[PDB]
Ligand binder design. Structure first.
Ligand SMILES: [Mg+2]
Ligand SMILES: [Mg+2]
Ligand SMILES: [Mg+2]
Ligand SMILES: [Mg+2]
Ligand SMILES: [Mg+2]
Ligand SMILES: [Mg+2]
Ligand SMILES: [Mg+2]
Ligand SMILES: [Mg+2]
Ligand SMILES: [Mg+2]
Ligand SMILES: [Mg+2]
Ligand SMILES: [Mg+2]
Ligand SMILES: [Mg+2]
Ligand SMILES: [Mg+2]
Ligand SMILES: [Mg+2]
Ligand SMILES: [Mg+2]
Ligand SMILES: [Mg+2]
Ligand SMILES: [Mg+2]
Ligand SMILES: [Mg+2]
Ligand SMILES: [Mg+2]
Ligand SMILES: [Mg+2]
Ligand SMILES: [Mg+2]
Ligand SMILES: [Mg+2]
Ligand SMILES: [Mg+2]
Ligand SMILES: [Mg+2]
Ligand SMILES: [Mg+2]
Ligand SMILES: [Mg+2]
Ligand SMILES: [Mg+2]
Ligand SMILES: [Mg+2]
Ligand SMILES: [Mg+2]
Ligand SMILES: [Mg+2]
Ligand SMILES: [Mg+2]
Ligand SMILES: [Mg+2]
Ligand SMILES: [Mg+2]
Ligand SMILES: [Mg+2]
Ligand SMILES: [Mg+2]
Ligand SMILES: [Mg+2]
Ligand SMILES: [Mg+2]
Ligand SMILES: [Mg+2]
Ligand SMILES: [Mg+2]
Ligand SMILES: [Mg+2]
Ligand SMILES: [Mg+2]
Ligand SMILES: [Mg+2]
Ligand SMILES: [Mg+2]
Ligand SMILES: [Mg+2]
Ligand SMILES: [Mg+2]
Ligand SMILES: [Mg+2]
Ligand SMILES: [Mg+2]
Ligand SMILES: [Mg+2]
Ligand SMILES: [Mg+2]
Ligand SMILES: [Mg+2]
Ligand SMILES: [Mg+2]
Ligand SMILES: [Mg+2]
Ligand SMILES: [Mg+2]
Ligand SMILES: [Mg+2]
Ligand SMILES: [Mg+2]
Ligand SMILES: [Mg+2]
Ligand SMILES: [Mg+2]
Ligand SMILES: [Mg+2]
Ligand SMILES: [Mg+2]
Ligand SMILES: [Mg+2]
Ligand SMILES: [Mg+2]
Ligand SMILES: [Mg+2]
Ligand SMILES: [Mg+2]
Ligand SMILES: [Mg+2]
Ligand SMILES: [Mg+2]
Ligand SMILES: [Mg+2]
Ligand SMILES: [Mg+2]
Ligand SMILES: [Mg+2]
Ligand SMILES: [Mg+2]
Ligand SMILES: [Mg+2]
Ligand SMILES: [Mg+2]
Ligand SMILES: [Mg+2]
Ligand SMILES: [Mg+2]
Ligand SMILES: [Mg+2]
Ligand SMILES: [Mg+2]
Ligand SMILES: [Mg+2]
Ligand SMILES: [Mg+2]
Ligand SMILES: [Mg+2]
Ligand SMILES: [Mg+2]
Ligand SMILES: [Mg+2]
Ligand SMILES: [Mg+2]
Ligand SMILES: [Mg+2]
Ligand SMILES: [Mg+2]
Ligand SMILES: [Mg+2]
Ligand SMILES: [Mg+2]
Ligand SMILES: [Mg+2]
Ligand SMILES: [Mg+2]
Ligand SMILES: [Mg+2]
Ligand SMILES: [Mg+2]
Ligand SMILES: [Mg+2]
Ligand SMILES: [Mg+2]
Ligand SMILES: [Mg+2]
Ligand SMILES: [Mg+2]
Ligand SMILES: [Mg+2]
Ligand SMILES: [Mg+2]
Ligand SMILES: [Mg+2]
Ligand SMILES: [Mg+2]
Ligand SMILES: [Mg+2]
Ligand SMILES: [Mg+2]
Ligand SMILES: [Mg+2]
Ligand SMILES: [Mg+2]
Ligand SMILES: [Mg+2]
Ligand SMILES: [Mg+2]
Ligand SMILES: [Mg+2]
Ligand SMILES: [Mg+2]
Ligand SMILES: [Mg+2]
Ligand SMILES: [Mg+2]
Ligand SMILES: [Mg+2]
Ligand SMILES: [Mg+2]
Ligand SMILES: [Mg+2]
Ligand SMILES: [Mg+2]
Ligand SMILES: [Mg+2]
Ligand SMILES: [Mg+2]
Ligand SMILES: [Mg+2]
Ligand SMILES: [Mg+2]
Ligand SMILES: [Mg+2]
Ligand SMILES: [Mg+2]
Ligand SMILES: [Mg+2]
Ligand SMILES: [Mg+2]
Ligand SMILES: [Mg+2]
Ligand SMILES: [Mg+2]
Ligand SMILES: [Mg+2]
Ligand SMILES: [Mg+2]
Ligand SMILES: [Mg+2]
Ligand SMILES: [Mg+2]
Ligand SMILES: [Mg+2]
Ligand SMILES: [Mg+2]
Ligand SMILES: [Mg+2]
Ligand SMILES: [Mg+2]
Ligand SMILES: [Mg+2]
Ligand SMILES: [Mg+2]
Ligand SMILES: [Mg+2]
Ligand SMILES: [Mg+2]
Ligand SMILES: [Mg+2]
Ligand SMILES: [Mg+2]
Ligand SMILES: [Mg+2]
Ligand SMILES: [Mg+2]
Ligand SMILES: [Mg+2]
Ligand SMILES: [Mg+2]
Ligand SMILES: [Mg+2]
Ligand SMILES: [Mg+2]
Ligand SMILES: [Mg+2]
Ligand SMILES: [Mg+2]
Ligand SMILES: [Mg+2]
Ligand SMILES: [Mg+2]
Ligand SMILES: [Mg+2]
Ligand SMILES: [Mg+2]
Ligand SMILES: [Mg+2]
Ligand SMILES: [Mg+2]
Ligand SMILES: [Mg+2]
Ligand SMILES: [Mg+2]
Ligand SMILES: [Mg+2]
Ligand SMILES: [Mg+2]
Ligand SMILES: [Mg+2]
Ligand SMILES: [Mg+2]
Ligand SMILES: [Mg+2]
Ligand SMILES: [Mg+2]
Ligand SMILES: [Mg+2]
Ligand SMILES: [Mg+2]
Ligand SMILES: [Mg+2]
Ligand SMILES: [Mg+2]
Ligand SMILES: [Mg+2]
Ligand SMILES: [Mg+2]
Ligand SMILES: [Zn+2]
Lengths: 112, 116, 14, 140, 154, 59, 101
RNA sequence: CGUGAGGGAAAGGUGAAAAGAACCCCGGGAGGGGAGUGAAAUAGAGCCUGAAACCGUGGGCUUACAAGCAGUCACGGCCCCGAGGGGUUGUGGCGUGCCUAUUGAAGCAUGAGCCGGCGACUCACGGUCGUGGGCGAGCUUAAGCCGUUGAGGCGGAGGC
RNA sequence: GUGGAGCCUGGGAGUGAGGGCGCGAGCGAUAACGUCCGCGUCCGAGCGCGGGAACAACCGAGACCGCCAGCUAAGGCCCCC
RNA sequence: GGAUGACCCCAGGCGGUAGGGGAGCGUUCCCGAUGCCGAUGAAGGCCGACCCGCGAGGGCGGCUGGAGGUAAGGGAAGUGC
């Protein structure tokens, strides 16, 4: 039995969150919580929420026990980009891409 | 009436790319680069089908030489012996005989020496 | 884009 | 029918006394032994030749004025880094390199050919440490 | 490219812009631009030689006769402008609706009765063409209409 | 200068290979002696306020 | 007890029971053909010079087939020359029954 | 956008029906997980189909002594599918991208980041051959007129 | 001498920047991967195949397809091969 | 050969740029169609190691998709990157 959450349209660049997500893939929910708490990255805040939301879904909707949860799968997909103008010298305009993340976390039960 | 492209180009591009599976980077993802790769691959195959007949005959000859020297003659002497004896067992089989059936290769060496 | 910055002159290969 | 391809064989060690042999005309015979082209089942994409043990490499022989005239060279990669050593010198210093360098030049370049070089064991002087392998004396 | 809505200004200078040369955006090489050799209004008609269409009318009729599919009828009994009247007539005449029929009659009431049937093509005699004869499996004509067909191939 | 520019696009193989050295290392964590919460070594415990055995700052 | 027979301009070692594909023979399936013997070996050695006079290898024609397709491609640079050709080589599948001698 | 004359876009589609998801859970929200609607919810409104480039997660094979237009031929190893086939690639052999322009290009000569879609020999009238038919010292109508309402016929002026 | 020979009438062209080599000359310096004619040949279009270490035009030879068969050409046969 | 592509047999040709010529594939649309295929699933998509074709292609099968498609034989072009 699995439980998941997906944070869609998180306004952060996928590459930057994946580093935070790579820390917790395969960890127990308790270790992943500790890691995220003391990770010095913006993406840590967003990943934590998806982690805790999927955990709530596990306990609340899918008859899974908190004391047995681990991160069976997690990944960051890229969503639609915010395109914005960056003005440069000599009358030239550049297009900053404000990229966007679909964060996903899937917990399972590690029996024993 | 108007005949827009429609499905024709994509189906043509997919034929090339499927032929291109297992290639490196864009050589299996980019249609242009897949086709470019396949031009070269098709000529190599025509060229190497010819080359295989040279590759194997070259291997057999080396193996025949080795088995001949065990009986104290070289390939040149052996072949000319088989010629004069009228033996036409080709090099593919002489190599199998040389390895699989040494008692038969021995008698073949014998007839070759005797012939001259 | 609407405006082209002029390119640098060449080195005078004269 | 497909041309026979042999299963893996236990390699055969042999021992050659280089004393008084012509450097080039021994090197070819060793290169051939190392390629296994003396075996009817010779196959070009596998190391299946012999392990060759050479002794008395110091007493190799050479014709003409090659002791003084033949030049081994190495390039360091640095400005002026062409070092030159004559056969005379090389024998007096690393005599197992004379035969070694001659055989290596007669092996195929590439990963297999380089593995074949590893199978040749050249020794200055009359003794070798491979008694455990019990090599077979050869009269090349 | 001349009839398209855009302007004739050059969008950027010929040289030194790092981009390709272009004139106006109406050129067929732009999206939304002109069409190179697309259709314009056309008259597709041509004058087929008279004797060829006369000979064809004959030969069309001749083909149906050669296979015994031409029926001349002298009158249309109960047919007074109702379809049920034409069917009942058609029944007594072998026109059972399993075959497409080209009905050629000057009688307006008979063409009225027959028009709506999927298997009947209505036609006046002044109208007999080969396409309608060939479109259909068997041909049926007035004696009055067979007179006109005979006249137009004389 | 004369504006150095990349000569070829970097392949997915070369791009990711350069990122061979990019994994975050997880933070150093140790249990706090007083409340058994997990926290970075050599810092006042943010969960109970203890360090070196004494309540240092209320949390 | 094997034999070296010659068929379709090529040579093959054959023993009783061998299923073997050769160039297409003009023979109805289920028929039996005699192949010429160049050499015999095993429990005795006979060496044709070139063909063993008495000997013969008996084969049963199981069927006829078309080989899996090779694509014969041709390309010439800077000249717009391309040629695509599908080739299937026809063959005949034989069962070796006995080696006469 | 341009002082102005002037220039001048992009942007269509849930479902039969809003039945457009009450209520509960995590969350500041956004978003999600359940519940519910529907024939269908990777039809959930950022909505039909949903290709490609491109980014990721998982798995099989593989790689840290090796020289490379990236493939091809051979054999061997491993994984998959059931005298065979598919995936992979370790060693051996061979191997100078594509297009364009040129006497001659892998060329250190041109063009192209890659993918999708748009993108260039046509039409009218006249001519000249060839060809399929009709008629043949003859052949043929034009504009029009009548009929039809996807029916054809008349019209000989004129042309060859 | 029956050949992708020849001749006649007609439809459609492209080409009208050649280049190397051999031989005969001119120009040049009995120089040039020079230049300009002539006869021939190849590349061009045979950057397809073998040899020549590698290499359009030197030597061998004109590739419809397939073969894990055989004889040769130039060139080769100590090892790389 | 049989009797004017009905298939067979024997022999020969089949490198190719500019270019000439031949035969075909596929796209849009019209007639064939008041028909026929279609929710027991249209077109389009994604696979396939299968079948046919020298090839361009065409089948067939599985998944997706959810409402269209269209034969033999012909006709016309905004027809293949
Ligand atoms: Mg940190
Ligand atoms: Mg909880
Ligand atoms: Mg700035
Ligand atoms: Mg400014
Ligand atoms: Mg940009
Ligand atoms: Mg950007
Ligand atoms: Mg960018
Ligand atoms: Mg983005
Ligand atoms: Mg188009
Ligand atoms: Mg691969
Ligand atoms: Mg590959
Ligand atoms: Mg790839
Ligand atoms: Mg591919
Ligand atoms: Mg790929
Ligand atoms: Mg890709
Ligand atoms: Mg090819
Ligand atoms: Mg071949
Ligand atoms: Mg050959
Ligand atoms: Mg040998
Ligand atoms: Mg001979
Ligand atoms: Mg022989
Ligand atoms: Mg054995
Ligand atoms: Mg610039
Ligand atoms: Mg010796
Ligand atoms: Mg070996
Ligand atoms: Mg000396
Ligand atoms: Mg215009
Ligand atoms: Mg205009
Ligand atoms: Mg306008
Ligand atoms: Mg305008
Ligand atoms: Mg204008
Ligand atoms: Mg103007
Ligand atoms: Mg203007
Ligand atoms: Mg310019
Ligand atoms: Mg310009
Ligand atoms: Mg510009
Ligand atoms: Mg540029
Ligand atoms: Mg441009
Ligand atoms: Mg540009
Ligand atoms: Mg441009
Ligand atoms: Mg311009
Ligand atoms: Mg333009
Ligand atoms: Mg323009
Ligand atoms: Mg437009
Ligand atoms: Mg528009
Ligand atoms: Mg035009
Ligand atoms: Mg037009
Ligand atoms: Mg016309
Ligand atoms: Mg009607
Ligand atoms: Mg009707
Ligand atoms: Mg009808
Ligand atoms: Mg500087
Ligand atoms: Mg500078
Ligand atoms: Mg400066
Ligand atoms: Mg600097
Ligand atoms: Mg700069
Ligand atoms: Mg790079
Ligand atoms: Mg990339
Ligand atoms: Mg990657
Ligand atoms: Mg890659
Ligand atoms: Mg890099
Ligand atoms: Mg870096
Ligand atoms: Mg890393
Ligand atoms: Mg502690
Ligand atoms: Mg075969
Ligand atoms: Mg090929
Ligand atoms: Mg070429
Ligand atoms: Mg090219
Ligand atoms: Mg090339
Ligand atoms: Mg060329
Ligand atoms: Mg080309
Ligand atoms: Mg080409
Ligand atoms: Mg073909
Ligand atoms: Mg303004
Ligand atoms: Mg304004
Ligand atoms: Mg305007
Ligand atoms: Mg709708
Ligand atoms: Mg609606
Ligand atoms: Mg419905
Ligand atoms: Mg709450
Ligand atoms: Mg919500
Ligand atoms: Mg959730
Ligand atoms: Mg929800
Ligand atoms: Mg249903
Ligand atoms: Mg779906
Ligand atoms: Mg749907
Ligand atoms: Mg719909
Ligand atoms: Mg969708
Ligand atoms: Mg989507
Ligand atoms: Mg992966
Ligand atoms: Mg080393
Ligand atoms: Mg290694
Ligand atoms: Mg290379
Ligand atoms: Mg091999
Ligand atoms: Mg296999
Ligand atoms: Mg393999
Ligand atoms: Mg390799
Ligand atoms: Mg190309
Ligand atoms: Mg090309
Ligand atoms: Mg140019
Ligand atoms: Mg030039
Ligand atoms: Mg290069
Ligand atoms: Mg380059
Ligand atoms: Mg270039
Ligand atoms: Mg130029
Ligand atoms: Mg170009
Ligand atoms: Mg650009
Ligand atoms: Mg790309
Ligand atoms: Mg494109
Ligand atoms: Mg034209
Ligand atoms: Mg004309
Ligand atoms: Mg005409
Ligand atoms: Mg006429
Ligand atoms: Mg006549
Ligand atoms: Mg007339
Ligand atoms: Mg000719
Ligand atoms: Mg001719
Ligand atoms: Mg023409
Ligand atoms: Mg013509
Ligand atoms: Mg020209
Ligand atoms: Mg001129
Ligand atoms: Mg000229
Ligand atoms: Mg000239
Ligand atoms: Mg000239
Ligand atoms: Mg010159
Ligand atoms: Mg010359
Ligand atoms: Mg001479
Ligand atoms: Mg002169
Ligand atoms: Mg030269
Ligand atoms: Mg000269
Ligand atoms: Mg001269
Ligand atoms: Mg010449
Ligand atoms: Mg040219
Ligand atoms: Mg040649
Ligand atoms: Mg050549
Ligand atoms: Mg020629
Ligand atoms: Mg060449
Ligand atoms: Mg070259
Ligand atoms: Mg050559
Ligand atoms: Mg060469
Ligand atoms: Mg060359
Ligand atoms: Mg030929
Ligand atoms: Mg020979
Ligand atoms: Mg010779
Ligand atoms: Mg050798
Ligand atoms: Mg033939
Ligand atoms: Mg040709
Ligand atoms: Mg067509
Ligand atoms: Mg349309
Ligand atoms: Mg209709
Ligand atoms: Mg039905
Ligand atoms: Mg249904
Ligand atoms: Mg279905
Ligand atoms: Mg369709
Ligand atoms: Mg359609
Ligand atoms: Mg298909
Ligand atoms: Mg489908
Ligand atoms: Mg409908
Ligand atoms: Mg249709
Ligand atoms: Mg049709
Ligand atoms: Mg029709
Ligand atoms: Mg039209
Ligand atoms: Mg067009
Ligand atoms: Zn604490």
């Amino acid at each position: 039995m699995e439980a998941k959450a997906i944070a869609r349209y998180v306004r952060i660049s996928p590459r930057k969150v994946r580093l935070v997500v790579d820390l917790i893939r395969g960890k127990s929910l308790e270790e992943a919580r500790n890691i995220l708490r003391y990770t010095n990255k913006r993406g840590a805040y967003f990943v934590a929420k998806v982690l805790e939301s999927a955990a709530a879904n596990a306990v609340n909707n899918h008859d899974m026990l908190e004391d047995r949860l681990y991160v069976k799968a997690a990944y960051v997909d890229e969503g639609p980009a915010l395109k914005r103008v960056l003005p440069r010298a000599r009358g030239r305009a550049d297009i900053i891409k404000k990229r966007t993340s679909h964060i996903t976390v899937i917990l399972g039960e590690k029996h024993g | 009436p108007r005949a827009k492209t429609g499905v024709v180009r994509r189906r043509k591009h997919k034929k090339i790319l499927k032929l291109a599976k297992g290639y490196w980077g864009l050589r299996s993802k980019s249609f242009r680069k897949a086709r470019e790769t396949l031009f070269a691959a098709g000529n190599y195959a025509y060229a190497h089908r010819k080359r295989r007949k040279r590759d194997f005959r070259r291997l057999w000859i080396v193996r025949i030489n080795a088995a001949c020297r065990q009986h104290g003659l070289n390939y040149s002497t052996f072949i000319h012996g088989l010629k004069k004896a009228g033996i036409e067992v080709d090099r593919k089989n002489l190599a199998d005989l040389a390895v699989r059936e040494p008692q038969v290769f021995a008698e073949l060496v014998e007839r070759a020496k005797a012939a001259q | 884009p609407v405006y082209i910055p002029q390119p640098r002159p060449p080195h005078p290969r004269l | 029918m497909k041309t026979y391809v042999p299963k893996q064989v236990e390699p055969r060690w042999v021992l050659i006394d280089a004393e008084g042999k012509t450097l080039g005309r021994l090197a070819t015979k060793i290169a051939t032994l190392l390629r296994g082209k003396h075996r009817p089942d010779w196959t070009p994409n596998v190391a299946m030749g012999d392990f060759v043990v050479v002794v008395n490499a110091d007493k190799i022989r050479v014709t003409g004025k090659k002791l003084e005239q033949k030049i081994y060279t190495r390039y360091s990669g640095y400005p002026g880094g062409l070092k030159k050593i004559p056969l005379e010198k090389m024998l007096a210093t690393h005599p197992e390199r004379v035969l070694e360098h001659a055989v290596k030049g007669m092996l195929p370049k590439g990963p297999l050919g380089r593995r074949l070089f590893k199978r040749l064991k050249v020794y200055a002087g009359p003794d070798h440490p491979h008694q455990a392998q019990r090599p077979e004396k050869l009269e090349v | 490219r001349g009839e398209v809505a855009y302007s004739g200004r050059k969008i950027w200078p010929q040289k030194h812009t790092g981009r390709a040369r272009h004139g106006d955006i109406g050129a067929p090489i732009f999206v939304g631009g002109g069409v190179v050799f697309g259709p314009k209004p056309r008259d597709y008609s041509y004058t087929l030689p008279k004797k060829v269409r006369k000979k064809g009318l004959a030969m069309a009729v001749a083909d149906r006769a050669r296979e015994g599919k031409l029926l001349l009828v002298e009158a249309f009994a109960g047919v007074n402008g109702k379809t049920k009247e034409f069917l009942a007539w058609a029944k007594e005449a072998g026109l059972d609706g399993s075959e497409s029929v080209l009905l050629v009659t000057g009688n307006e009431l008979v063409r009225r009765a027959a028009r709506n049937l999927p298997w009947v093509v209505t036609l006046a005699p002044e109208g007999l063409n080969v396409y309608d004869i060939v479109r259909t499996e068997r041909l049926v004509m007035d004696l009055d209409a067979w007179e006109v067909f005979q006249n137009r191939i004389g | 200068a004369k504006h150095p520019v990349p000569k070829k696009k970097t392949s997915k193989a070369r791009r990711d290979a350069r990122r061979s050295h990019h994994a975050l290392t997880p933070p150093t964590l140790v249990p706090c002696p007083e409340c058994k919460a997990m926290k970075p070594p050599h810092t006042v415990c943010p969960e109970c306020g203890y360090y070196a055995g004494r309540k240092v700052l209320e949390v | 007890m094997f034999a070296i027979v010659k068929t379709g301009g090529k040579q093959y070692r054959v023993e009783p029971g061998l299923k073997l594909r050769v160039e297409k023979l003009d023979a109805e399936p289920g028929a039996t053909v005699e192949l010429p013997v160049l050499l015999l070996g095993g429990e005795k050695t006979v060496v044709g010079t070139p063909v063993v006079e008495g000997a013969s290898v008996v084969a049963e024609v199981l069927g006829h087939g078309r080989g899996k397709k090779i694509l014969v491609s041709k390309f010439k640079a800077k000249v717009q020359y391309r040629r695509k050709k599908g080739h299937r080589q026809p063959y005949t599948e034989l069962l070796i029954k006995e080696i006469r001698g």
